[PDB]
Design a protein around this ligand. Structure first.
Ligand SMILES: Nc1ncnc2c1ncn2[C@@H]1O[C@H](COP(=O)(O)OP(=O)(O)OP(O)(O)=S)[C@@H](O)[C@H]1O
Ligand SMILES: [Mg+2]
Lengths: 115, 39, 145, 50, 261, 261, 261
């Protein structure tokens, strides 16, 4: 986890992991957030890219989460929250946990069929 | 993790046999995740 | 006999006595009342009441175990790589018997003086021990984190 | 009465429960299926040898 | 509420120097029968199971079963001041964050009290069930350490191949190949260097060399060693602790990349 | 006009490594009574004092009182290349800015001479009266070194307490608490010293690990060391070098605060 | 098809200890007459020579000669697990890259079956003069080792003069000129032990302490050793076992640099 984070205490880490991949017989997974690690690192490795997830899907997922905790909430509020977090799932989930367990923001009725 | 000590000699001496051998406990409590460290 | 400064002679001891940012005050009040608080980053102007709110929240949530289940770091302490390597992980792994829903608490006073690699180390530690340990931090400029 | 965060409360147990990046999780799941199949075949080879 | 009065602390010294770098924490599972330790190493491919019987201690008291995870670096520090001949007191409360080690120095009154917190392990006891071992070996202590160090001087992977005579240890390295055969040296003056074999079938496995070195670092505590090895099982290296207890070593064999015909 | 003849350079090497990290510079003042050093820390929390009588040197000569200041780092660089068995000469002129170290030949074939510039600095004579201490003990130096380096890796600070029962060391570290208790009946066998008290009232104070470790860097000077300790007047570490002089150390305690309700 | 059978392990275990860090390669010339070792230093200063006879070995078998080459360190590691009373047997094949090593059992039924990879280099021929020497002395081995170890503390080059008064070993270095002179008479618990001189002209040269210390590591082979010294040729030391062969080690002199006049 975070192969990109290297300290002076972490001496010879890239050479070390080079030796690991060189001599392994078990699966090894490297994860990071920077795109630059792909170019500076030398070796043979399969690449897997996670794109930013779709806003409406994670909005529906967060809305199911708040529905399970006995809260009904509009989609557009979660869309604003996600775009404010640049669609970060853990940020939106944690702030939703804080804002739900605080008792909710504003009690306003909204009759929607698409209580 | 970067939070733990990850120097080359230490990581090689305490993690090579994870991929060069079998697992001593292949049954029972196996789906736990020990964070590898050296304090 | 000593002239205690009024800034600490009249620092509030209960959360309701703090004014300003009243919505977050009520949210901190209900989290002090019930518990299972998430990790908190308070950001604002200096002298607003951030450290006061954090310390009063910790006191209300812990009680008698405030000397043991609570630990504090400020810029006066080391706060380098080696301490966020050893000390905070040792506490986050450390066993403390607590009432239900109550977790061990670490306060990072004015985290804007954390070095970047110190935060890079702190991430895994704060995220894996979330079952028994919660973190609270204060800062003035959020971009320094 | 809970003592644990929503991130680990609604932590996905299954790769199908992840949201978004469907192609990436299928590639990763297929790679790990291939590797566990290789490990199982090596185990079968070990029992066949002895 | 737990109290142990270890009649001698040097055995704790020897077992900890056996495990000072292999395993990362030490777990004490404590009941009426005694003190148990089920620790699986940093690579989690070898297991150490240490059992101390209640009669071995000067006093033993256990009101309820207790599981304490303790940092190994901490105990490795505190015990380097412990004397070669001494009494040690393990102190543990029922539901506390504490573990006290009381050292009575050979002075009239020089009490050293080290209090350590608990590292809150979520991993419980782990151990294999009892199984018939086709290869049970009574073998000596010191010469095992000599031949492990010779194999270390030769290679880094160990070929264990038991046979009708005994067992053969092979090591093919870049420097060279070294193969030492041990067999029935039972007819000898002392029973500790006597080698008697009650094996069932010849079976070969291969193992990590450095681990065998750390496990044979515990040589001088026991006069002899028993080995329990068979097919598809960890190698077992077990020592008997005279009038205190018994210790067990489990070794997962090296994975082999067998090639299809 | 100043001549001093250090009988053995081992003592000078030992006191230098005892104070190598403590102080920025060494300012000695010389009188017909002898040589004195009362230099107080750059972090301003401790004072080193060393008084050496004139008769301790092989030949001690003075014309007047002189206070000279020498940078410590180059002084260490010069003295680390001197034999311990050697007889040393310290020569100082009346008004020159250079001090001469005339080492005799350690190899009996090459007399060495080194020079040092003088560094002017404001040095005050911290003339503290020697008040009666409510706690006085004598206890061997090597043990005090081993226990400070024991508690240093435990704690960032040590709680000393002196009572009628004995002298007591606590250190509440993050790994846990470390306690050492001594007794007056507790007599050691390493250097054959019976720990004694001349105390009057129990007292508890707290001192940092770093300074005390570098006070134990003065271990080889004397077999036993005298600790003087009071409720207000701070920690005194006193080595009595045989026929050379006495080496006093003043360390102030950390403040203590009561935890809020 | 070559197979050599040495009767006790006391021979190889100490002649190789003499060559612990002298020559990087053990170079054997295997003939039907016997084994020879012709290995030459990388510093162009020291030559080593062994001639093991067929009569000394238990049984000697040769089908063809060998330019045999063995790495030193791995052979030492194989040697370190040889019994002192055990029979050494070594096999070299016609074309294989393995050197088999089978020893008698140190545990009386625990035998070894070792291998050794063969390394192939230039194996250049080394010429021995087989000349006459101006001074030959029969000398005790352990006392020579004592003198060499006593003079090794002082410097690096020792001057050696052999005359009718005997040998004179002086370490003219830093600590002092340690003068050791042995006459013809030497009285021990044995009936005779003579440092006897059979000379023509008095010789005076200079040798190195490190190679002499390496040469003295062959002490237990022969209680009496023949030292040969002439004006221009290197020092020859010859340990005669009187049944195995002769250890002939040659050390080139340190030429005194002639300063200009
Ligand atoms: N909202 C408030 N209500 C009551 N007292 C307050 C409030 N804000 C500040 N104080 C007082 O002023 C002191 C400073 O409070 P702090 O919480 O330390 O300030 P801050 O908001 O944390 O920003 P800092 O300390 O500059 S990082 C407190 O100890 C109180 O005595
Ligand atoms: Mg603040």
């Amino acid at each position: 986890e975070e192969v990109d984070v290297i300290f002076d205490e972490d001496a010879g880490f890239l050479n070390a992991i080079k030796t690991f991949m060189a001599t392994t017989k078990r699966p090894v997974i490297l994860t990071t957030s920077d795109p630059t690690f792909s170019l500076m690192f030398d070796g043979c490795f399969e690449e897997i890219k996670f794109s930013t997830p779709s806003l409406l899907n994670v909005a529906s997922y967060l809305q199911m989460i708040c529905l399970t905790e006995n809260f009904r909430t509009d989609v557009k509020d979660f869309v604003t929250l996600l775009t404010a977090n640049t669609c970060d799932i853990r940020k939106s989930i944690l702030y939703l946990q804080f804002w739900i367990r605080s008792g909710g923001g504003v009690l306003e009725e909204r009759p929607l069929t698409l209580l | 993790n970067a939070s733990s000590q990850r120097s080359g000699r230490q990581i090689l001496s305490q993690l090579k046999e994870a991929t060069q051998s079998h697992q001593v406990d292949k049954q029972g409590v196996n789906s736990q995740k020990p964070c590898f460290f050296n304090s | 006999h000593y002239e205690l400064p009024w800034v600490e002679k009249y620092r509030p001891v209960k959360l309701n006595e703090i004014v300003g940012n009243e919505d977050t005050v009520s949210r901190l009040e209900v989290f002090a009342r019930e518990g299972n608080v998430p990790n908190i980053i308070i950001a604002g102007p200096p002298g607003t009441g951030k450290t006061t709110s954090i310390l009063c929240l910790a006191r209300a949530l812990l009680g008698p175990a405030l000397k043991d289940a609570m630990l504090e770091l400020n810029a006066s302490n080391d706060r380098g790589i080696d301490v966020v390597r050893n000390k905070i992980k040792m506490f986050a792994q450390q066993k403390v018997t607590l009432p239900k829903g109550r977790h061990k608490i670490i306060i990072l006073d004015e985290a804007d003086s954390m070095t970047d690699g110190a935060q890079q180390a702190l991430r895994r530690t704060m995220e894996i021990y979330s079952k028994t340990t919660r973190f609270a931090l204060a800062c003035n400029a959020s971009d320094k984190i | 009465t809970e003592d644990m965060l929503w991130t680990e409360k609604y932590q996905p147990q299954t790769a199908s429960e992840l949201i978004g990046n469907e192609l990436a999780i299928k590639k990763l799941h297929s790679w790990l299926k291939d590797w566990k199949r290789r490990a199982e075949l090596e185990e079968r080879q070990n029992l066949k040898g002895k | 509420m737990f109290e142990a009065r270890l009649v001698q602390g040097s055995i704790l010294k020897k077992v900890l120097e056996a495990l000072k770098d292999l395993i990362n924490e030490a777990c004490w599972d404590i009941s009426s029968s005694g003190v148990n330790l089920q620790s699986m190493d940093s690579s989690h491919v070898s297991l150490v199971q240490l059992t101390l019987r209640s009669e071995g201690f000067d006093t033993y008291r256990c009101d309820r079963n207790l599981a304490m995870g303790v940092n190994l670096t901490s105990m490795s520090k505190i015990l380097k001041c412990a004397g070669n001949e001494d009494i040690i007191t393990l102190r543990a409360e029922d539901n506390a964050d504490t573990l006290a080690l009381v050292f009575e120095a050979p002075n009239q009154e020089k009490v050293s009290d080290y209090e350590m917190k608990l590292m809150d392990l979520d991993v419980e006891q782990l151990g294999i069930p009892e199984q018939e071992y086709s290869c049970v070996v009574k073998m000596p202590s010191g010469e095992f350490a000599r031949i492990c160090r010779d194999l270390s001087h030769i290679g880094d992977a160990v070929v264990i191949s038991c046979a009708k005579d005994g067992v053969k240890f092979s090591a093919s390295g870049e420097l060279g190949n070294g193969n030492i055969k041990l067999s029935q040296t039972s007819n000898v003056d002392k029973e500790e260097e006597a080698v008697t074999i009650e094996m069932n079938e010849p079976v070969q496995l291969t193992f990590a060399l450095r681990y065998l070195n750390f496990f044979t670092k515990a040589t001088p505590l026991s006069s002899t060693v028993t080995l329990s090895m068979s097919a598809d099982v960890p190698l077992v290296v077990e020592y008997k602790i005279a009038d205190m207890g018994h210790l067990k070593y489990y070794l997962a064999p090296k994975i082999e990349d067998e090639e299809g015909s």
